[PDB]
Design a protein around this ligand. Structure first.
Ligand SMILES: [Ca+2]
Length: 240
């Protein structure tokens, strides 16, 4: 997260850290959202490679023991059937991970609230992006969970020539673009929490930013619109 601030520890309890094994050590690569005690929602491009993955819930500081963490392996990876790794702009950047064991829900670990199917947010709706991703373009990961206020930019405006143009689809959500705050590498797969009817719901899965950089004016961070995949998500969890 570029231009963010440290989140209160465990204030976004559904946020998870997706890590892969590199030799005898582990490295954070993406964010994700705990949607069931044994299911995590993340981006398809995060699990495109054949690596050994593990999920960490209740995490805050990646390098220190916070006394709230739970580590669990990944038993199954279900990528959306239309996902095309060579065309992130085509959409479908979403994947569901079945955890090897069910995590224990508590003060630091809770399920994320998903939107009702088809829900579209009005322009400039209040949302927050969270993650341990780079704090600057071509920079380094954040040690502690970061958050940044990132209001939405409706489709009509985001898909115009002044912003992303035809690179964005109606199956995506755009947020930010103020040139100061944005998601960045490492935030991928993470949530976009938006205030709807008094509660924060996960409306987006961080997908991509401009090749020019993370925080670019009129180049909002783009997210997979969760509300367009509710039926798919329910069908996978109900038959797997
Ligand atoms: Ca920690």
């Amino acid at each position: 997260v570029v231009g963010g601030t440290e989140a209160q520890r465990n204030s976004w309890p559904s946020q998870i850290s997706l890590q892969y094994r590199s030799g005898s050590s582990w490295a954070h690569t993406c964010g994700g959202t705990l949607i069931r005690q044994n299911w995590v929602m993340t981006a398809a491009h995060c699990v495109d490679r054949e690596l050994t993955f593990r999920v960490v819930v209740g995490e805050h500081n990646l390098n220190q023991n916070n006394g709230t963490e739970q580590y669990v392996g990944v038993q199954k990876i279900v990528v959306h059937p239309y996902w095309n790794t060579d065309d992130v702009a085509a959409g479908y950047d979403i994947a569901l991970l079945r955890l090897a064991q069910s995590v224990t829900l508590n003060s630091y670990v809770q399920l994320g609230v998903l939107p009702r199917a088809g829900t579209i947010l009005a322009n400039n709706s209040p949302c927050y992006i969270t993650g341990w991703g780079l704090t600057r373009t071509n920079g380094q990961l954040a040690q502690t969970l970061q958050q940044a206020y990132l209001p939405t930019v409706d489709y009509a405006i985001c898909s115009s020539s002044s912003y992303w143009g035809s690179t964005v689809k109606n199956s995506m959500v755009c947020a930010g673009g103020d040139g100061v705050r944005s998601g960045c590498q490492g935030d991928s797969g993470g949530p976009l929490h938006c205030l709807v009817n008094g509660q924060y719901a996960v409306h987006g899965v961080t997908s991509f930013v401009s090749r020019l950089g993370c925080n670019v004016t009129r180049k909002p961070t783009v997210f997979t619109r969760v509300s367009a995949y509710i039926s798919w998500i329910n069908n996978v969890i109900a038959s797997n």
